[PDB]
Amino acid sequence: ADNKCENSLRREIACGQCRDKVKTDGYFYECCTSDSTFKKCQDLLH
Fold this sequence. Notes:
Name: Mu-scoloptoxin-Ssm6a
Number of strands: 0
Distance between the termini: 26 Å
Order of helices and strands: HHHH
Entry title: Solution structure of mu-SLPTX3-Ssm6a
CATH class: Mainly Alpha
PDB class: toxin
Keywords: Toxin, mu-SLPTX-Ssm6a, crustacean hyperglycemic hormone, ion channel inhibitor
Number of helices: 4
Strand content: under 5%
Shape: globular
Assembly: monomeric
């Protein structure tokens, strides 16, 4: 898929945080193109 975050600044800023917390390389690029993966990240930030 394409980089959704590239179009949504919020999605980019959000993934950036989880990328560090989750401590998983590629996570940022994964959640950016993964609606399901965002669910988990949404819980952590919550």
